[PDB]
Design a protein around this ligand. Sequence first.
Ligand SMILES: N[C@@H](Cc1c[nH]c2ccccc12)C(=O)O
Lengths: 331, 331
Amino acid sequence: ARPRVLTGDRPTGALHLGHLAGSLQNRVRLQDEAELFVLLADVQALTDHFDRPEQVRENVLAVALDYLAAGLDPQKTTCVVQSAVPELAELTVYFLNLVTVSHLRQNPTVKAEIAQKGYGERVPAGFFVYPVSQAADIAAFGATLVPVGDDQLPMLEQTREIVRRFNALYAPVLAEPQAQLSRVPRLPGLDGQAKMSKSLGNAIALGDSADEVARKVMGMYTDPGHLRASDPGRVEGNPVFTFLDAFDPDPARVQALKDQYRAGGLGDVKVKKHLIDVLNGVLAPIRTRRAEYERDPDAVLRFVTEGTARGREVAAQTLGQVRRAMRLFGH
Amino acid sequence: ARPRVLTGDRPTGALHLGHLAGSLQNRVRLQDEAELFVLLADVQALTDHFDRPEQVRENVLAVALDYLAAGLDPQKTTCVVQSAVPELAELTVYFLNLVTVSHLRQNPTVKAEIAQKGYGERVPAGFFVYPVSQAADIAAFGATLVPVGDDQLPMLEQTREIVRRFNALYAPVLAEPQAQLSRVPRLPGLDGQAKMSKSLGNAIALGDSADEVARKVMGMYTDPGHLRASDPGRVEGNPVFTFLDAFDPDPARVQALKDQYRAGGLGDVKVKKHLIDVLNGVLAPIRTRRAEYERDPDAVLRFVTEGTARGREVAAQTLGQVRRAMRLFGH
Ligand SMILES: N[C@@H](Cc1c[nH]c2ccccc12)C(=O)O
C-alpha cells in the first residue's frame, strides 16, 4: 500500500473471462502491493447508456459482486460508486476549460468508439468529453498509478496533459499519474472474433455455471480448415489455444498440445476437453465466492457503501486544494 | 412574487449602462413581481478567463456591489455565486448526455463568439459547452421565467429542449423555462458598435464619475458627413439617439431632436449635452447607493453569502429529485 492505483469499469453488464484475463487478475495482485481503488463508473456508463438508466443502476451491484467473486478483498480494495461522489462532476467542468474541442476530437480511442457506435456527427456531448471526466476521476482520488492497455493510453496521456495544465495555471496541487502498461493482448471471443462481449454473444460470464462453461467451450470456433481429428490444424487464430495461453497454469502441457495439434490426430475435442479442465480450475474458486456472496447481499453492499465513503472523503480533500488553488471566491 | 426568475452575469468586471437598460432596471421591477435569482456566473466566467482566475474572484463582489447600487434589494433578490453551488456542475454533466456535438456546433451565438475570439477549432471545451451549463443553471433553480436578449434565444430554446428530453427519458421533474423578451435591443457601444463592453473599451460603467460620463458622451461616435452644426444630420446609426431612446423618459422630447437633427439647427453638442444629463439623472441615485454600501462592505458580503446559501438550498432540492428521477444507484 504505497502508490494509490486507480482502476474501474462502467457498469453495463456482468463481467466475463475477458475482464478476468484483461484486468481482474492483475488487480487482485495490485491490492497487495498498492492501495487499490476501483471505480464503478455509472456516470460515465451514462454517456452512452443515458437511455437505459435501469441497466446501469442494476449493474453497479452486479459488477461489485463480480469484483468480489474475482477475489478483490473488501479489506484491501476501496470500491467506489462514481454517482455518489459529485466532487468528480465539479472537477470535470473545471477540466473542460483546460482542453480544446480540437484535441478532444483527435483522441484515437474515442474516435474509434464513435466509429464502431455509428454515431456519425450525432455524438452525445457527454460521450465526446468523457476522457476528461476520467481525468477528473484520476486527479480527484489522487492516483499516481493507472493500469492501462495501449487502448487507454490516450485517455491517460490526456489526463497527464490536463494535470500539467492545471498545476502550471493555478498551483501544482495535482499528482501526475503514471501508466502501468498493458496486460498482453485482449482475450478474443468464443467464435474467434477480436472482441469478447455479452453483446456479441460470444462470452463466458464469471458467473456462468461449470456446466455452461463446459458447453460454451465445446462450441468454440477452432480452425475452419481443420475438419476431423486426423487432419492437421492451425493454432494461430484458434481461440481455444489463445484461451490456453492466458489461463493454463503449465505451458508444458500447452506447448505439447500445440505440437500434437499441428501434427494431426488431436481433435478439437481432446484439446477443448483440456481447456475445460484449465478453465474450471481458474473459475471454480470464483464461482464459490460468488455464490457465497449471493447469500450475503449485505456483505456486497457494505463493500461499496464503504469504499464510497472513503472515496468521497478523498475526492473531497482534493477539491479543497483545487478550489483554493483556482482562487475560487471564498477559498 | 409568483414565478421563479433566473438572471445573471459573467463576473469579469464592473457593470455598465448596457446591463442597466439590458436588464438591471428590468429585474429591479420584476424583483417584487416574482422570486428573482441573480447568478454570478463564476464558473462560466472561467470558460473564458480560466487563465485569469484572480480577475473573476475580484469581480464577484464588485458586480454584487453593482447589483445593489442598481436598486436590487437584499430582502427581495437571491444573489448566488455559481462556484459555491457544485450541484450545478453535477447537473451540467448529466445534461451533456442529452445533446449532440453537432447540435452544439450550430448555436449561432456561440459560433459568433468563437469566430470573434479567434479560437478556430481550438475552442476550449468548457466554452463550446457553456450553453448547456446555462441550461443546468436554469433547471437547478427551477426558473420558469428567463429574461433574454434577442441574442440569447438559441440558448433559452436549447434549455427547453433538454429539459423536455430529460422529463421524457427519466421523469417529469424539471420545468421548461419561458422567455421574457425585451424592447431595447442590445444597447450599442459609445464606439457605434453593436456591443458595449469593457473589453471593447466603449462602455460607461455604473461607477463612473459625473466627469467621466460627460467625457465618454463627448467622444461618442456620432455621424461622419455631419461636420458642422448647420448641416443636416441623420439618426440612423447614431448611438446618441439610441441612447436617448433607452435612457430618456420624454419620448415627445426625443422625437423632437429627431426632427431638428434631420433639419439643421440642432448641434451634436446640444444633443450630447442633453443626453449626458439624462444619464446623470438615471445615474444619480445609483451613485449615492453605491457609496452607502461601499462604506458597509460587510453588507455586500452578506448579500452574497446569504443568497448563495438560499440558492444552494434550492439547487440541492432539485438535484435530489433529478438523482431519483435518473435512478442513480442508491436513490
Ligand atoms: N472502461 C472505462 C473504465 C473507467 C471509467 N472511469 C475510469 C477512470 C479511471 C480509469 C478507468 C476508468 C474507461 O474507458 O475509462
